[PDB]
DNA sequence: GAGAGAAGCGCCAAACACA
DNA sequence: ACTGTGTTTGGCGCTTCTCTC
DNA sequence: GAGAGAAGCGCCAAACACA
DNA sequence: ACTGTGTTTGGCGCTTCTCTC
C-alpha cells in the first residue's frame, strides 16, 4: 500500500485502519517453516511501522479506532494452545506475536488513551480470553501477558474484583482438579504488586484470600520453581497488619513435610524472613510450638 | 557476525539465535569450533554469596574474588596477586559499583571476611554479614571460559580476559528457563504498586517553549509537549510531521494553556 | 563626505549620519569596510551541539585525565554514554594503546557494547593496536577537529565531576586507597545522584524500556555557501584571516581552505560572516 | 540514615529524600557539610562597580600599555575620565616616574585638573617623585587591590579600544608615523564617536553646562559581618580557604584575615558565604 | 591655595580672584613674587593662524610650532628639534586632537607650509589653506611664561614646561573683556536654532526599570524617569527623597505608562 | 529655619515658599563692603540649597509657586542701573545675583514647567524690565540675560513679535538718539539664533528688519567690538534666499569709509564671506561696481 | 474566631571549570 | 561526518500553618 | 483603486578582550 | 576607601512606500 506518514492528514487515520486490516490475515509457521514469505515480511514491516508511528504523535487515536485494534489483538492472539509436551519449547510464530504485543502495550500506555472508551469495547470476555493465555509454554509470552494485565487492572476500575475472583477460581482449579499449569509465578508477581497497594484496615476478603489460596499452595510438588514469588507475596502481605500473622505460622507449621526431604530448605528460608519481620512488638504466642516442631 | 562473535567470546547457541544467526546456522557454528566440541533470594540485590578461587597459571597464580547474586546469578569478579581483608573490601566495593548495594551478604569464614576491617566496611553501608562453613557452578563456568580465552591467544594480560568473560556471561549467554540474560533479569524494573479504590492515572508531562538548533534565532515558538526525555535532550514535536531532539539550553518550561 | 571621512578616520555609524547620510547607507559603509571587520573581535554565529545517541549504547565519548595523589600521577580513563550519561572509569599508571584497549573492555563489560565511539586525536587513540581492537568488535571510531577541546564537552564535564567527587572523598580520609575511592565515586554518580533537568538517575535511563524506537533522520544539508573570515583553531590571533569561500558546510562547522594546497574544518566559533565581493 | 549516607558518599539532595528526609532537612544537611562547600567552585555573591565621578574632572583612572610597532615597543600612557569618558594618551620609550609625571601633565593640559586619581600599585605610580608631583598639584592618589585587574575596568577597556583603532589605521598605511596615528585616534574617539547608551560624544559631556550640582552622599556602611570562604587574589587554587570572620566590609570588598598576623582586602568575587558555627 | 597656585603657574590676579583668594589678597600675592614685579573669525574653529618660533636655550635650540584660534585665542604648541613638512603635519594633527577641526587655515610661506606634503595633508581633511607673507602677542606671552618656569627651576625637561604653560594660558588666565577663560569661551555651546511658528518644546527623557547596586536582587522594581545621564551611569530617583547613579548594566528601557 | 528636604512631604512645598521670602530681603554690597555678613551668608546658603533641590525632584512646582518666584526675581534683579564710568567695572553684588540667575535658569528649563501658566504671570512688563537690563556694565550678567531671554522667547509664543518690535526700537534708539550702549553683541547673537530658524519664503517684515536696522549698524564708530556677531548674522540671514543679497551689497558699498582708516579690515573680511557665499548661481549684477569701488 | 506572620517547597538565572 | 555541558546556589513566588487581639 | 510585498529604521541580547 | 566595561552584530518588530490584479 503506502507508508502511513507520507499522506495528507485529512485521510491519514483512514490509512491506519487499512493497515490494521492488513495484519489480521493469518500465516501459520508451524504448518511449514517456509510459506508465504513475502506476505509474512509485509505483515512484519507493517506491524513495525505502525508501532513506530503510534509512539511519536499525539491525538492519533480516535473513536473508530478502539474496536478495530481490539479485534486485531483478539484475532492474532486469542487461539487454541499448542499440544503439550512438558530447555522449553518455543512458539514458532513469535516474531509477529511479539510485534503485536509491543503494539498493544504502546497503545494501552499512550497518554491520549482514554480510560472510558474501553468500557464498551473491553468486557469480561476480553479478560477471560486474555487470562486463559497464562498456560503458554513460552516464557516471553507469559512475561508480556503479565505486563499487559498489570496495565489493564491498573487503568480500569470495574474489572478489579472480577479479575480477583477469576484468579481465585484459577488457583482452586490448579491446586485441586488439574496440576498442569505453568503460569503460577507471573500471576503471583502480579498478585504481590496488587497486595502491596492495600489500605488500613485490611478487608476480610483479603484474609480469606490469604488463608485459603496462598497458604495451601505450599502443598504442591512443584513449589520449588515459583517459591521466591510466593514468599515475597507472603512477606509483603503480612506487613500491613502485624496481628494477622499467627494463622500463617500455624498453617506453615502443618504443611511442613514431617519426613526428611530436599524441600525443607524452602520452608527454612521462608521462616527466616517471617521470623525476622514478626519479632518486633511482643511475638511469643506460638514461638514455643514453632521451635518445638522446628527441632524435628 | 555470529562467526566472529563466537570466535571472540565462545558464547552459547541460544545467544547466537538472537542475532542474525538462525537455529541451524547456530547449530552448525557451535560444533564447527574446535575447543567447543534453587534460588534463595526474593528480589534483585537481596542476598549475595562471596567465594574465592585460585586460578592456576603456568608461572604464577591468580586470586579471583567472585560475588554472585542469588536471584539472577549476576557475576562480579576481580583478580588480585594476594588476598587480605583490604582486598576483600576492594572486591566488595568494586562489585557495588557494578551491581548496586546488597541488603544481605553471606560468605565463608577465613582469615579475611572475619577480621574487624571487613566488619567495619560492612557496618558503614548497613549490610548484614552472615558467616557459614561447609554457588560453585558459576565459578567453574568462568574458569572454563578463561581457559578457552587463554587457549586461543596465550599473550593475554589477564585483565582483558576477565573483562571479556564477565561480558560474555552477563550480557551474552541466555538463561534456559526464562530466556533472559543475567543482566536483563537483574536490571529489569519491578512492577509499581497499585493504590486501592483509586484509578491508576497516566503521568502528564510538561510543556516547553523551544528553539531550533543551528538557526541563531531569538524567539521562543509556541508551547509544545515533550514525548520522551533523556540526559541533555528532549523529544519535541516541532510540527505534526517530525520530532526532534532539542538540548536543554534551548528549552524553557511553561504552564498548560487551558 | 561620509566615505572619505570613514576612509580617513574609521569613525562609527552615529558619526556618519551627523555629516550627511541615511542610516542604511552608513550601515552599508561600515559593513563593507574590510579593515574594520578584519580587526573587530566581535562576531555572531550560531551555536553547535555535540552528536547524541537515539537510544542507550549508541554513541560513547572517551578521554583520559591526570590525577595527582600521594606523589603519583594516575591516569584515569573515562568512557561516558551520551544518551543516559552513564560513566565508567579505571585508573592506570601510564598512557599506552594497551591501557586504552583494557579500559575500553572494562567499559564494555560494565555497560554493554557501543555502536560508535568518538574520541580526540590523541597518540594512543589513533594507534594501529586500538584500530584493530575496535574492528575486532565492530565499533566505529571517528575523531574530532584537532585543537578544539569543546567538541568533547560531555566527557570533559564528566572528568570535572569525577575529580570533584574524588577531592571531596580525600578531604575526609587522606589515607583512603585509590580504587576504593574510584569505586565509591562511580556508585554515587551512576546510582545515587539524580540528573538536573529530567529528574532520573543515569541508571534508570540506561535500563529503561527500550520500546520507544529510533526516530528517522535526514542527511540533507544546506545547499549554499558563503564567505567567511576565519581563525586556525590551534593558534589564536588578534585579527581574522580571509575572506575565503567554503567548499561545503555541515551543522556545526565549515570547510575552509586555510592555504592554497590544503583545506581544513573550522567550527562555527572561529568564523565570521563576510560580504559577497560580486 | 541520610546523615550517614551523605557522610559516606557525599550524595546530592534529590538522593537524600529518596532515603527518607524532608526537603528542607536535606537542604540543611548539604548547606552544613564543609567538604562539599570547600570544593564546589560555584558561589553566588553580589557584583561590584567602580567608583565614578559626580561631575567632570572629579575622578580619573590611569594606566600604561605596550604597543609593538616596527620592532619597537612603545609605552602608551593613558588617562581616562570616569564621568564623561574623555581619554588622553601619550607615547613614550620606556617606563619611569619622570615619564608618568610628564604624561600626567600632558593630560592636565589637555583636559583640566582632576581632584582624585586612582591607579594600580605599579613600580612607577607609587614612587616618591610621583607622590611629590601629585602633592604639588593637590591631587589625591589612591590605589587598588594588588592582583585584581578588573578594578580598573574602564581604563583597560579604553586601552583595548585605542589599540583596536591603531590597528585599523596601520592596516591601511604601514608606513604611517606613530604620533600622527595616536593624534588621529584621539580626535576620533573624543570628538567623532558617539557613546552607546546616552548617545552623546565624550566631548559634549565633558563641556556640558555644569549647572546641575553634586547629589549628597552617605558614608554609612553595613553594620554586621559574616563568615566567608576566600581565595587570595594573586594565586588561584582549586578549593576555598577558611572560613573566617570579616573585620569590616565596604561595598565591593571585605576585610579577611588571610593569616593570623596580617589581614587583607578581598573583593566580592573571591568570597563565598559560610554558615555561622554558633 | 592661591599662594602655591601662583608659585607653580605664575597665573594672573583675576584668575586668583576666582579661587579662595580675594581682591586685596590677590593684589598682595601678585607683587610679592619676585619674577612677577581685532578678531577675524566668526565662530570657534573658523580660522586659525600658524606661526613658528625659535626658543633660545643656553646649549641648544627649540622649534615651537604654534596655532592660535582667531576667535578665542586658544593656543596649541609643540616643540621639535628640527622643522620640516612632516613636523608641520604632526603639529597640525596634534592641534586637531586638542581643539577640533578648523574650517580655514592661514599660515606664512616657507620651506614647509608650501610643499606638496602639507597641501596633501590639508586636502584630505577638507581644510582650505591660504598663504600670506609680510598673532604675535600670544607667542610672546608663551615665551615669557617659559622663561619664568625655567628661571624658578633650571632642571626642567622642556616637555613639562610647555604643558604647564599651555595649561596656564588656556585654563587659568581670565580674559579681561568678557571675564572668560580661553577654554571656556572656545568650548561653550552655541545657541540652538528656533523653529518659527512652532513652540520650542522641552525634551522628554526615557523611562527605565532599575535595580540597586550591591544587592544581588533579581527583580526590576518599577519604571522611573532618568534626570541626568553620563557615560556608564544614569541618575535615577529610587524614591522621592534621594537619587542614585545606576550603571547601565542594571538599567532596562521601558515604555511610558499612560 | 530648616533644610527644605528634611520635612514630611505634606507641608514640604510650604517651607519652600518661606525660603523664597527669606531671599527677598535686600543686602547692599556697594553701600559698604562689610555689613550683615551673617544674613548675607544665610541668603547665599538658602539660594544654593534651593537651586540644588529644584533640579533633582519632579513635580515640585505647583500653581501657587509661579508668581512668588517671579516676584523674587523682580525684587532681586529689576533695579536702577549703577552710575556709568565707561578692565571693566564689576558688580559688587555678584554672588547673590549669580545664585538668583542660576535658580531662574534651572526653574525655567525644568521638564515640569508648564508653558501655559506664565501667560498670566509673565506679561509685557516682565519682558520690558528684563530687556532694560542689557545695559549692564558687567559681562557675566549680560551673558546670563542672553541665555535667559533665549529660553523665554523659545518657550512662549505670544511674546515673539512683541520682543522683535521692542528690539527694533532699541536698535533705532541706540543708532540715532543715544550712543551709550554695551549689549549690542549679545542681542545680535540672539538675533542670529532667531534668524537661522526661518522658513520659506521669507516674510517681508524680516526684509525691512535687515535693510533698516542691520545694515545701518555699520556706520557707528564702535563697530569693531561686535563685528563678528553682526557679520555672522548677515551671512546666516542671506542663505535662506540667495536673491535678496543685492541690496546688502549696494548698502555695504556706500557706508564704506571712502578715506583711509583702520576700519577697512572689517569691511574686507565681511565682503570676503559675502562674496564666497554669493558666487554660485550667476552673480555678476553688481560685481563690476563692487570691484570698481573696491579698487579705491 | 480570624486574618496575619512563619515555615515549607518548587523553580530559575548567573557562574564555573574540564580541557 | 564536522558541532559545550552539567551542576551549584541564593533569591523569589506560592502554599500551608500557627500564635495573637 | 487597494491591499499586499519591500525597504527603512530603531532596539536588544549575546560575545569579546583589555589586563 | 575597598568594587568590570564599552563596543559590535545579526535578528526582529514596526513604520512607510510601491508595483500589480
Ligand atoms: Zn568456540
Ligand atoms: Zn573602516
Ligand atoms: Zn558532603
Ligand atoms: Zn610669580
Short mmCIF file of N, CA and C and ligand atoms in Angstrom, two decimals, chain E residues 6-7 10 30 33-36 148, ligand 4:
data_model
loop_
_atom_site.label_atom_id
_atom_site.label_comp_id
_atom_site.label_asym_id
_atom_site.label_seq_id
_atom_site.Cartn_x
_atom_site.Cartn_y
_atom_site.Cartn_z
N UNK E 6 50.07 80.26 42.44
CA UNK E 6 50.90 81.23 41.73
C UNK E 6 52.36 80.79 41.71
N UNK E 7 52.86 80.23 42.81
CA UNK E 7 54.25 79.80 42.84
C UNK E 7 54.52 78.68 41.86
N UNK E 10 52.37 80.96 38.01
CA UNK E 10 52.52 82.39 37.76
C UNK E 10 51.33 82.94 36.97
N UNK E 30 50.42 89.12 44.16
CA UNK E 30 50.91 89.35 42.80
C UNK E 30 52.28 90.02 42.81
N UNK E 33 55.73 88.44 44.61
CA UNK E 33 56.53 87.45 43.89
C UNK E 33 57.60 88.18 43.10
N UNK E 34 58.84 87.68 43.18
CA UNK E 34 59.98 88.42 42.66
C UNK E 34 59.91 88.57 41.14
N UNK E 35 59.82 87.44 40.43
CA UNK E 35 59.88 87.48 38.97
C UNK E 35 58.68 88.17 38.33
N UNK E 36 57.61 88.40 39.09
CA UNK E 36 56.38 88.98 38.55
C UNK E 36 56.41 90.50 38.56
N UNK E 148 59.93 82.27 32.76
CA UNK E 148 59.70 82.24 34.21
C UNK E 148 59.85 80.83 34.76
ZN1 LIG K 4 55.10 84.68 40.49
#
